[PDB]
Design an enzyme around this catalytic site. Sequence first.
Site, mmCIF file in Angstrom:
data_model
loop_
_atom_site.group_PDB
_atom_site.id
_atom_site.type_symbol
_atom_site.label_atom_id
_atom_site.label_comp_id
_atom_site.label_asym_id
_atom_site.label_seq_id
_atom_site.Cartn_x
_atom_site.Cartn_y
_atom_site.Cartn_z
ATOM 1 N N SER A 1 0.865 -1.178 0.000
ATOM 2 C CA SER A 1 0.000 0.000 0.000
ATOM 3 C C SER A 1 0.903 1.230 0.000
ATOM 4 O O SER A 1 1.483 1.582 1.031
ATOM 5 C CB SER A 1 -0.937 -0.001 1.198
ATOM 6 O OG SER A 1 -1.779 1.136 1.181
ATOM 7 N N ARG A 2 1.017 1.880 -1.159
ATOM 8 C CA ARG A 2 1.896 3.038 -1.275
ATOM 9 C C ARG A 2 1.501 4.146 -0.310
ATOM 10 O O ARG A 2 2.353 4.939 0.104
ATOM 11 C CB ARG A 2 1.880 3.563 -2.710
ATOM 12 C CG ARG A 2 2.658 2.714 -3.694
ATOM 13 C CD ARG A 2 2.491 3.240 -5.104
ATOM 14 N NE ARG A 2 3.760 3.341 -5.814
ATOM 15 C CZ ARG A 2 4.606 4.355 -5.694
ATOM 16 N NH1 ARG A 2 4.366 5.364 -4.873
ATOM 17 N NH2 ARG A 2 5.722 4.357 -6.417
ATOM 18 N N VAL A 3 0.221 4.219 0.058
ATOM 19 C CA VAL A 3 -0.226 5.269 0.967
ATOM 20 C C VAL A 3 0.518 5.173 2.290
ATOM 21 O O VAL A 3 0.956 6.185 2.850
ATOM 22 C CB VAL A 3 -1.750 5.185 1.168
ATOM 23 C CG1 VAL A 3 -2.163 5.965 2.397
ATOM 24 C CG2 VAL A 3 -2.469 5.705 -0.061
#
Lengths: 46, 365, 364, 530, 152, 166
Positions: free
Chosen positions: D355-357
Amino acid sequence: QQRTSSLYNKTRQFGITAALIEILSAMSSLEGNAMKGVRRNKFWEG
Amino acid sequence: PVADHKGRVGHVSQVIGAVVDVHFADGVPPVLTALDVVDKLGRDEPLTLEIVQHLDAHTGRCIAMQTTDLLKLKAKVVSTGGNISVPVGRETLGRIFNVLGDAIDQRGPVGEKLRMPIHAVAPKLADQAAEDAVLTTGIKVIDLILPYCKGGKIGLFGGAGVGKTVIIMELINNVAKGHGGFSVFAGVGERTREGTDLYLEMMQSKVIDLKGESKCVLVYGQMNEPPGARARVAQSALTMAEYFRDVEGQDVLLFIDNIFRFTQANSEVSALLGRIPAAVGYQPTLAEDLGQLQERITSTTKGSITSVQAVYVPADDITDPAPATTFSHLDATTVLDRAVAESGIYPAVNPLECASRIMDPDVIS
Amino acid sequence: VADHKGRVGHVSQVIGAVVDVHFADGVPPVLTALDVVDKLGRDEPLTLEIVQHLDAHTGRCIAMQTTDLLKLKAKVVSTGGNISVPVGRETLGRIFNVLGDAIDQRGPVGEKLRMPIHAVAPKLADQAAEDAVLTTGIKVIDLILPYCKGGKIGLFGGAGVGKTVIIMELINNVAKGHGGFSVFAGVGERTREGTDLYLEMMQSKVIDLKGESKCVLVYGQMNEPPGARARVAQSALTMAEYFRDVEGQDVLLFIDNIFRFTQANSEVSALLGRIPAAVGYQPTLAEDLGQLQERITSTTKGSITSVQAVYVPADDITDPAPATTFSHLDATTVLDRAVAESGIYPAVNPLECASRIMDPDVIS
Amino acid sequence: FFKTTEMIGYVHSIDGTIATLIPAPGNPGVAYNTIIQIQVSPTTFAAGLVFNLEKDGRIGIILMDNITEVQSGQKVMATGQLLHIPVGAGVLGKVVNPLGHEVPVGSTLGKVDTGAPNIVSRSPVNYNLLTGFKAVDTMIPIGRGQRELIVGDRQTGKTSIAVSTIINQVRINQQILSKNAVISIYVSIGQRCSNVARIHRLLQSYGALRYTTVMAATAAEPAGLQYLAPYAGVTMGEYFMNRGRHCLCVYDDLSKQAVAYRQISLLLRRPPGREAYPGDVFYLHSRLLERAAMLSPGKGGGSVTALPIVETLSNDVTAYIVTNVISITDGQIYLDTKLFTGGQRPAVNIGLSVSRVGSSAQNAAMKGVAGKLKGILAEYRKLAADSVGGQQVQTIPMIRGARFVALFNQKQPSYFMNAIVSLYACLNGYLDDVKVQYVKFYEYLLVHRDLGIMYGTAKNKFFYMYVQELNYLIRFFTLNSPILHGELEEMLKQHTHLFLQHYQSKMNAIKSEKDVKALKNLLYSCKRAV
Amino acid sequence: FLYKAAEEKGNFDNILSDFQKIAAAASKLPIFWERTAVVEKIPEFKQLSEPTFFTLVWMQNNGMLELIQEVAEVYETFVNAKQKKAVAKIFVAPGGEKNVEEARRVAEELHKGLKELADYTLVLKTVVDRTIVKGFAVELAGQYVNKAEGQQ
Amino acid sequence: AAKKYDLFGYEVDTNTAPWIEKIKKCKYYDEAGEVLVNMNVSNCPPDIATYNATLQCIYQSPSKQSTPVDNESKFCAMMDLLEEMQHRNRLKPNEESWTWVMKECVKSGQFRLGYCIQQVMETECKGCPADLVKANEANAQKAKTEGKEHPGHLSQQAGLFDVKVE
Ligand SMILES: Nc1ncnc2c1ncn2[C@@H]1O[C@H](COP(=O)(O)OP(=O)(O)OP(=O)(O)O)[C@@H](O)[C@H]1O
Ligand SMILES: Nc1ncnc2c1ncn2[C@@H]1O[C@H](COP(=O)(O)OP(=O)(O)O)[C@@H](O)[C@H]1O
Ligand SMILES: [Mg+2]
Ligand SMILES: [Mg+2]
């Protein structure tokens, strides 16, 4: 493993290129068998 | 009612392989229309065409359910007043038919009180039935790992030499003989010898009782037949099953061998129709073409259909677009492995790749 | 027909983002910019860029926005030249699109001049006469893989390794040292990441709304069409060239990414119908990359260093796009997550890092 | 004062689901990507969309309905406007077509094609979105305004994940205000109407139809309809997004949309590319997904979350569409057939999932727990990598990682309170003496029922499992706080002591042919219950 | 080309008469004549006007002999525009065009509504539409009015 | 009195009195939530006073909607609002909000939640109201006397094989 990876990359590239070439050949056939247009020349000039 | 285009006359303009262009002065008939060639042409058999495209208001492009031998330009063709129609009802029980629905068993005339068009609209969402009932095929692996559902859809994915046909015959023997509902077999693009063997086995088992009452019908369009027939035979058989489902209210079995030939036949003519190849050489319309048929093959409120389809995986490559699309239009899938077959295990079934929808505790024990 | 500004034409064919234009007075030159003046109930202006001439009067163009609600015979007006972008110190701390229009909603630019997008690369005589070194102020970079003025730095590494931190530190160090502004170009990059980058820059004061800003931003997002995704980089390069020549400075052009630029050009070629080359990339890949890279060089007036983030599909450096990009790259900079996990910042692998000026000929 | 409709021309060619149009001489003309009606009958019409505009004046049309009723020479009219569809709170709990038509089962207008928010209109992703799955909520954070892909293979639970995510929000929507409630939009493409009906029945049974709507483009529908459905779904989500509310758009799946677009382009004679997908596929997906965003506070504060689904053939993630979508999205969730068969359901592969977030989308308590859980799982994986062909040494990291892996197994979404409590217990070691095969039964007893009350050893006041309203208190205050830390630790100690004293002893003492079978059945029942 | 040639002389009705002759000749001619037909050798076309014969020869040389109908339609459109005549298409059920008073009044109303056609004079052209069984429809300058019913 | 700039430096409208009045005039607290949404759309960020007014509207409202909603809880709604205020807006709750929460807990009869809120108020605010504490204690004692101290199936004794796991 390194050699197999190299061969795998080569094979994917070749497959992509071959598929593109086949599709482009089909399109060329279809289009070139219909390319047309009125000619503005002297048909009476026999 | 009578279609306004019945008896409409057209002339042949262009012929290429199984593709023929027809020009009508009055106007091109509707799509899916059936036409018959009137000129004798010295042919031993009649010539029938089905329209699939319109090139203009007056011109159309059609495929041939039969060969195009001895076909000339300007040939006279006449509309049949509607799409291709096939006989329906119990009068067809224990009988063999072709794509056109003409009896081919040489066993006498068939009494047909009703003809139905092959092409039909698929049932909507509201016309679906929620049935979750296991089926017993008498096979340990199938009944354990991937149990089948009554009125559901089953696929037998395999290559060549794995046992798809053998398993189909075994299921037929186990079930169709004792099943109250009738059965329909679709020999699409397969070996005529295998079809004959199946017919003989059915006669021995008394499923087809010539002197009495039968329980199964056969529709055979094989590899020898042209792509148009190889494509429309399955739809004809499906129309038969749809009639038995709706107008009667039965739980009918529908075996197909093999569906892949339908897509192959359509691809044989995609380019000639003038559609660019898409992927691996298959026609772009593969998804929709297969989805329409798969949706037509379903259980409804009135009746139920249990469908079993053999699927051919070229070069044992499951990633092929046709099997990939077929995967999503099935309830159960049985995948066969050449390695398992070589190891002497029969049936050669890979449970890891097998799957089933009803493998939930709510439905099964 | 030398001055084609204000020339009128009619739209004759529309397919996707490709538009054919008929001019009675003759088609304008190549790369020319046109605007759709007709009121079509469109929420945004529509502009086109000429790329081919079908005949004397007919020309093919690509749209920088969607062609929705577009009818045949619609009027089109030439802009009198190539695409124009503002230049100067007014752009500092501002976000731009391809068309040189601010989207920060922070008042007018007040630019004193505009410059064309497509400008020929510096000639041989205009090249720098001596190879130099860029002092980044960072020990690792300035020691093991020193950068060269007017050169290209290929940056490899994703998130979690402080790529944005390194970029901001590089801009700050350059301004503190050589005294040159920076230009960032987001080509086919995520809008969320662009927003986060803008917020971080404002927090760090490199882009101060109420004060001096050391960086300009140009953003062609993935939502934008391929034409804009391709030309945004040229716009940023135009700004950098203006800084190099007029102000005689040492500019830094950050690009994220170059692979997206290549992909956009490939999509444009496919739309125009040119048959793809190997893999599927456009045949004009090398020429397109050169027309950008050669414009990045050290001149007698100033320097334009470049830092280009590179994404390698399938982890195959053999792929034509990364191979051609490397053929132009001067130095390399690799980021590894293991280094950050250990706790060394900036996370750099000097063993994998490399440079070409690592020779006593230039350095001591 | 008559009902005038602009006629543009006639139908020239028919090829499957598309068509070509010849305009009548001296006619107003039609725009691009507009809607037209083909007059099959004087009272019936078939819907079509403009896709090409040739130099000669011919037009390319994509059909949407009543295709069999189309024939050459029929008349055509143009609406002159883009595609607008009904939207509002009156659509929830219903199955609809991309054109807005309602599908029989047993407020305003919104444009399908709208631009995405600019840079200044967005805000960093902070608010969490809960799928009800511990693995997702811990290792792969999902935040509102995020675009998280779900990439797997056939028969891996991809659609089940999204359905459970939608269902888990029903309770939250019932409890909290509608302002912060999540509105679900599930898009089915090229799937079976039977599967759509099953999904609808499941949603109705779980009561999710109230806050959920379905957009169906089942097979037997035209490729144009299948290609349009996702944009209509995004428009329906944007209706709430621009009005300060949060939406969750699920797509199943983009692969068939790409296939339909390819089919349309090839039928319309457009230049193809790799795998024959034209060069506009990437732009199509990008403009579909970028419409999901976290709007800035001044723009309303609404959000749209994207959960597209993708299928890979034999783990061929290098495919064109998969690569494009992975590069576009803000992270991926990878499902593994190996784990799915092995029993890890869901079969998430943490190594392949990201999850890049980041952790900014996790809640404070979940954030703190994950900060240690991630490292613990990393250490367990590192040790298991070497433990392939050697005896294992039961260390604390390995034990806790195994217990976490056992916990991650689940069928239905788990409430935040129970999930976080179980994870905290495992992290702090209250399960170190518990058996891996009995962790599920332990959790079932801890969550569904209680032992302190049963055995008359209650000492806490407010920290009890049956008080489901403590979830918001936990969200507000981290578990590692003096307010709840002592009560939580006391309850966990009591439960663990009672379990070890009474239940696990009997389990270990089981020696029979029937008791063992009963224990196995109980363990499986607990496993697929919690 | 035909319009310019006709304009050079100021007469256009000769072109329409030639097109009617061509339609009659095509009706009399065998099937698929245009595929291999020679306009010079065809006897009927020898009586046509010089511009029409020249255009026919040009289309024969290019092989595009199937566009005669559309070329005639375009020429008629140009002639009507030049002469300031607006033609309204009245689509009527197959068989029976007696019920045309309603169509005429509807066309007059549409002409009045269309301020751009005020200079032009209204004309009516009846066309049989097999689709409709009853009623009629009116089209004028792209404005289409449906007042017909089909089979149920 | 002083301008407040948003994330990007743009100012915002600090005049929230009309919206507070609308909230006080609402009937169902879902309408108050809608009002907060409208404020966010109009760029008038809610303040501590606005949140306290919303809490008062929740406490004094009959129900979530005109029609009953299953498993609705004023306590849960107010806790969610408090989380939104503190975490996503950086605003510390005041004693008024906690007093409203304790009043709601007492009115509902949730003595355990009353105890927890009392502890929270003692920790952060300057103690819990004696009246509310006494009311919570009285409710707890009443439940204990009547026999509703804890659920019934929990008190029920179940063996290893007796637990009827569904
Ligand atoms: N967490 C889970 N635990 C156990 N079984 C599960 C879980 N999630 C899904 N399943 C089961 O897995 C099977 C396949 O589920 P699903 O249809 O969601 O998978 P998929 O990857 O979308 O497959 P398809 O290609 O058929 O859509 C179903 O029987 C479903 O009940
Ligand atoms: N039950 C079985 N037991 C043993 N061999 C089998 C069995 N079923 C199939 N086979 C093997 O496979 C062959 C039949 O394969 P078949 O299913 O007809 O192939 P296809 O799917 O290509 O039509 C047999 O000749 C035999 O070699
Ligand atoms: Mg076989
Ligand atoms: Mg699924």
